[PDB]
Paper text:
The [name]‐[name]‐2 spike (S) protein is not only responsible for host cell entry but also the primary antigen for antibody generation in the human body elicited by vaccine or infection. Here, we report a potent and thermostable Nb, namely, Nb4, which can neutralize all of the Omicron subvariants at comparable levels. Structural analysis of Omicron S protein or RBD in complex with Nb4 suggests that Nb4 has a unique and critical epitope for the Omicrons that is evolutionarily conserved. Based on our structural analysis, in vitro biochemical assays, virus titration and challenge assays, combined with relatively conserved binding epitopes on the S protein surfaces, we conclude that Nb4 and its multivalent forms are broad‐spectrum Nbs for neutralizing [name]‐[name]‐2 VOCs, in particular Omicron strains.
To understand the neutralization mechanism of Nb4 to Omicron viruses, we used single‐particle Cryo‐EM method to solve the 3D structure of Nb4‐16t in complex with the BA. S protein in complex with Nb4‐16t, a “2‐RBD up/1‐RBD down” conformation of the Spike protein was dominant. Corresponding particles could be further classified into two classes. We solved the structure of the first class with three Nb4s binding three RBDs at 3.5 Å resolution, and the second class with only one Nb4 on the “down” RBD at 3.3 Å resolution. S protein in complex with Nb4‐30t, we also observed a “2‐RBD up/1‐RBD down” conformation of S protein with two copies of Nb4s at 3.6 Å resolution, with one copy of Nb4 on the “down” RBD and the other Nb4 on one of the “up” RBDs. In all three Cryo‐EM structures, the Nb4‐S protein interfaces have significantly lower local resolutions, which do not clearly show densities for Nb sidechains but allow us to build Nbs with confidence due to our high‐resolution RBD–Nb4 crystal structure (see above). Nb4 can bind RBDs in both up and down positions using the same RBD–Nb4 interface. The Nb4 unit binding to the RBD in down position appears to be more stable than those in up positions, likely because of additional van der Waals contacts formed between the Nb4 in down position and one of the two other RBDs in up positions (detailed contacts remain unclear due to low local resolution). Interestingly, the Nb4 in down position would collide with the RBD–RBD packing interactions in the “all‐down” conformation of trimeric S protein (RBD1 numbering 371−376). 4 Thus, binding of a Nb4 with one RBD unit in down position would block the RBD–RBD packing in the “all‐down” conformation and thus keep two other RBDs in up positions and expose more epitopes. We suggest that via binding of Nb4 to one of the RBDs in S protein trimer, other RBD‐binding antibodies or Nbs, such as another Nb4 unit in a multivalent Nb4, can then bind to the exposed RBDs to enhance the neutralization capacity.
Numbering used by the authors:
A (entry chain C), B (entry chain A): 992 to 1041
C (entry chain C): 29 to 68, 73 to 298
D (entry chain I): 1 to 124
E (entry chain E): 1 to 123, 126
F (entry chain C): 745 to 828, 849 to 892
G (entry chain A): 299 to 524, 530 to 677, 689 to 744
H (entry chain B): 546 to 595
Amino acid sequence: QIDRLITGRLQSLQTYVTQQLIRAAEIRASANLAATKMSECVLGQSKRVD
Amino acid sequence: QIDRLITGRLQSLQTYVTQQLIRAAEIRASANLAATKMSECVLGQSKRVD
Amino acid sequence: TNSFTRGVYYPDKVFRSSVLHSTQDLFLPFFSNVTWFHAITNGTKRFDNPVLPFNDGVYFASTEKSNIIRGWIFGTTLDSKTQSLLIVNNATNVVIKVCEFQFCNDPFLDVYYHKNNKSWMESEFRVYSSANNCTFEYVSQPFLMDLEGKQGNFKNLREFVFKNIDGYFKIYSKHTPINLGRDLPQGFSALEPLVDLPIGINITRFQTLLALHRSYLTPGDSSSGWTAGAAAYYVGYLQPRTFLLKYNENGTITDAVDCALDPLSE
Amino acid sequence: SAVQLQASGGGFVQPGGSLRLSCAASGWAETFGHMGWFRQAPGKEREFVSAIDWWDTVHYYADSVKGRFTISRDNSKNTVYLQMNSLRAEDTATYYCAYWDMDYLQNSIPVDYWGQGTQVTVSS
Amino acid sequence: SAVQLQASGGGFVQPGGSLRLSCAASGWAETFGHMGWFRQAPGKEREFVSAIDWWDTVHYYADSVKGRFTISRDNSKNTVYLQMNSLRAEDTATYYCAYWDMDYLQNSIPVDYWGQGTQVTVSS
Amino acid sequence: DSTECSNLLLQYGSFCTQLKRALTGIAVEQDKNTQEVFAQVKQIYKTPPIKYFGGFNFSQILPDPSKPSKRSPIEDLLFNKVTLLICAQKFNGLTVLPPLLTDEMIAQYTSALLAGTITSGWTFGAGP
Amino acid sequence: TKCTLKSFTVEKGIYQTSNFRVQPTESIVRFPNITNLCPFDEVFNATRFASVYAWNRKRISNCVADYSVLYNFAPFFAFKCYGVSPTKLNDLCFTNVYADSFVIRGNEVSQIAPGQTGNIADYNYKLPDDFTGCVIAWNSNKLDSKVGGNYNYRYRLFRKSNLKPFERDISTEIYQAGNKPCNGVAGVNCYFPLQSYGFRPTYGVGHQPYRVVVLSFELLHAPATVSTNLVKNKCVNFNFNGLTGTGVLTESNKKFLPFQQFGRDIADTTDAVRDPQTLEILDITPCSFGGVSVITPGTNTSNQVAVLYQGVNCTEVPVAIHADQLTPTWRVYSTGSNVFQTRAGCLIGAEYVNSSYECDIPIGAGICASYQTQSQSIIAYTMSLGAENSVAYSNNSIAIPTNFTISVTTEILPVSMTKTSVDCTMYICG
Amino acid sequence: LTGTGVLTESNKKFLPFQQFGRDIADTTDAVRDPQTLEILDITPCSFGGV
Ligand SMILES: *[C@@H]1O[C@H](CO)[C@@H](O[C@@H]2O[C@H](CO)[C@@H](O)[C@H](O)[C@H]2NC(C)=O)[C@H](O)[C@H]1NC(C)=O
Ligand SMILES: *[C@@H]1O[C@H](CO)[C@@H](O[C@@H]2O[C@H](CO)[C@@H](O)[C@H](O)[C@H]2NC(C)=O)[C@H](O)[C@H]1NC(C)=O
Ligand SMILES: *[C@@H]1O[C@H](CO)[C@@H](O)[C@H](O)[C@H]1NC(C)=O
Ligand SMILES: *[C@@H]1O[C@H](CO)[C@@H](O)[C@H](O)[C@H]1NC(C)=O
Ligand SMILES: *[C@@H]1O[C@H](CO)[C@@H](O)[C@H](O)[C@H]1NC(C)=O
Ligand SMILES: *[C@@H]1O[C@H](CO)[C@@H](O)[C@H](O)[C@H]1NC(C)=O
């Protein structure tokens, strides 16, 4: 009975982490874009349209 | 007992493949940046600041 | 027939502050048809408050002045072979006598002249035909708050939700002093629990107890249906309906929304 | 499973007396479980008495019944008896002829089927 | 059975003397059992001396105390007595108040309560 | 927190050191994400005491010392417009690690970039 | 850290090792709600007791029959409970205990039991063979017996059949044992069932009165008609009205409702609970646990390290870490070199310094640590963003470089990761 | 100790007591003749995807 409950509880934890990992990757892509924007738009002038 | 062992064994394999999929997605994002850097920084001169 | 928002009650004795709680208990559905069941001592024939089926609890709401509505009787067949639940309210007593009274009588009028000067508790309805299994009672301060209604702008909407969970019988009372428009206004008042009561028996059949003697200001009707006329008692019914009860800081249910009434509500 | 049990016997035994009971079986069962008696001492919990294997290969006895109890199945009418020697004066109980519908008794607490109570007092 | 037993009496007697001891029950009981007496001589075992039913109807006297010792119960102070007469040289024994927590004197062994020591010596 | 339960969890091996390690990488990366975006400037440039930039009014974005926090009216508007229980997560092992760079430090990094852009053009991003 | 890192030499950097979980100190069993009732004096202390032929049936309910009150009620009695020892019955609460009371004789004590026979067992009161409950049998010689001869009290000597389980019968018809009818007149074949009790001061102990009270419970769908402590801000295991769990019973400030008992929150946890005995609201907070991480400047440089219990207000339970309270052991740091409360837990073994340097070992909330000698030791400076610099901006000032510097910088980027391929049947199945 | 593999010679040094060889894995890389005290190196079958 515990083993059924542990696996159910453990599976939810693994889902959360694997959901956070892909979520964290989406932020990193946003952070990399923001870091690029700061380097180009702020620290200099950008000729790239839009 | 065998099925109980296969569930965990298969789940461990599934987690690794899922973890590899996320990890490779990060590498491709890094690989694309290197490909962009090679095309712009090496094959030419980049006006993009920093 | 238009319980616009009445019938909500605190599903449990749990405090909750500024949260949106979703429950799944038995509730009276929003905008349901409350039966007008109005009622009309001129004889013992021509019964005026017929029995009703107690299916998964009922929503009871009355607007008697001070003594027209006194109590309720429950059980299955209200006879000797079944438990009879007396939830009568006295002037200051609400004794919950669950004795299997061999029959539920009717208010034995002493004479046709009814309520000139008699206020004593004697020769009353006597529906408790003396019987054997006179089990535990909750004789206490009257849970039926026979409040001295006054100042106009009032009709004591003593909305009671009588439900029987796992045998335990619960009374959710909230007497309404505030003015109502016609019979039930568009407002909100969750019914705080009043009595936790074990009485582990079948409660399949229910009827009000017009322990009146007094031929006291009762209008006439002869049909059975579902409308919002001036009632001796409104009778809803509780269904396994999911509600989203909102809780104010002080843990008071400010408002709630039914989860099946409307697509927007859903 | 749906098994009907046919228990009979008893009487009015005496200090040092004995019983010779019977418990016939009839009805389809999931498996060939063991017949026997779950006697609760008067006012006590139901207690295993003595169980015989359906193949008549395993016999069981208990300290409260050792030396003065024995179970045996009739080979003709398939009515399992409860025949004893010098039953004591304290067995003033009601004896249920219970039915474990399992081929082996790991523990006696789960008793799939049961029987009727045999009320026998022990006094002269 | 919180049967509070109180012991009293003792001393030195002559060959052919007499004595009177008192023991009683209090607190609360599992049931009305048997009131009896025992002697556990130094190095010896607790030996059945005399048992009496609580209502002074069923009395018992051992062979060694037949015609010498006596047992009686008071009817107004909840006390039960004991007598001893005609003591020999080997009667020097230690006495503990006895108590049987059973309705019938099945054997001399079954007990649930005991008393405290009491040295008895015979001299002139 | 049941030992008999805990012993059975050991039978699954490193199925939970992975979660602690994998979730640690996320927490570390977020600190790198903030630093990468904002810590693009080596020094900390300060706006001169006078703030007449040829008629260009910057008081909206330039940090305002009047407020107790060193945030501009625009940043203060953003903070109030973003509403951030937590302790329940701190009840069952779901501790939330605070960020390495405080909200003040990040607002200080932004003021450096803001002062650098105004008083130094784009030259400060490519050298002195 | 070496165990968690699974390496013999750890490098500079904060490492998460284990979890610090403060253990509860005491246990509180507060479920009293004050509340007490049920008299027992009505069924025990009554001066006049109903006879055996008129035994009472008074089921006590909606209150508690505290057995400690009745455990010591008289010099001696037979607490002949059935099915459970009287002491274990104390907390054994029962749904509807039908408390029956009457009086018997002394020699008839053996005749008053389940399944017994006689003019007072078969003919006055029959107990079922499966009787569940208790029998309370004490003597009332000074009350139910008269020195002048108590014939006012009677024990029935004749009756027809045994009573049903828990059944009553008070038939007083003139019984006929022959063929001649009574015809309403006492005489031949005409016997009154009630025989007057022989209760004289000179009568024997076998004829002495003994009251008998039979308290019996039927385990039905009724409330068991038939134990507390106190606490403070210290963390304990709460049991408020049967609410299992452990937490810090800090003082609360919310306003409950006259009927609300078990306060809650968004989560399933019981955030608050009204204190039963004092009718006050108590706030429940989880025991202040949190992960513990170790700040180390690299085995090579030094073995000196400092630890950080993440997410704890340590200026309390981890600064008052008593003998072996801190999980990583070494209770010599109960106070430590310096305890520095931080927004990210608190540091033990590192001393805060006013001077701010570049971050070396990140900790959190703008605090970093490094192994900088002041005498090498761990410091906990506040991270410094950089050297503050002011540019002399002016309306007509321009700065123009006269020289330059061809700076060559390296950039490292991963491109491909190791290629792999698995096989379930080889992997999963040997 | 049950398993399969190529039972080649072992160049390692099983300290007397040691009988099961093992690498940093569940695999029992080495083993020792329980009837000749010879150490043998165990390598898995030369399988491989095709
Ligand atoms: C820059 O703009 C701010 C507003 O964005 C100006 O501040 C306002 O100044 C007016 C005076 O004309 C006051 O009435 C307002 O109350 C000010 N508002 C705030 C928020 O300060 C500021 O004066 C402008 N500076 C210059 C040099 O033009
Ligand atoms: C620009 O800088 C370079 C070095 O960064 C200067 O070259 C140096 O000149 C000094 C003489 O003052 C020599 O001692 C060094 O050996 C030179 N270094 C190199 C690498 O050549 C150069 O003089 C500077 N330009 C000006 C105009 O001053
Ligand atoms: C029920 O529904 C309407 C709306 O309240 C009510 O007015 C009407 O009397 C009822 N109609 C029926 C019985 O279908
Ligand atoms: C809710 O709580 C606040 C704070 O105690 C109080 O001032 C306010 O009157 C309450 N409102 C109600 C009763 O809903
Ligand atoms: C390791 O410690 C040595 C001294 O033993 C020191 O020289 C070296 O810089 C250290 N390396 C790091 C960065 O851990
Ligand atoms: C932590 O300790 C106690 C908590 O009971 C409190 O008095 C103190 O202010 C807390 N410290 C901080 C800085 O939170």
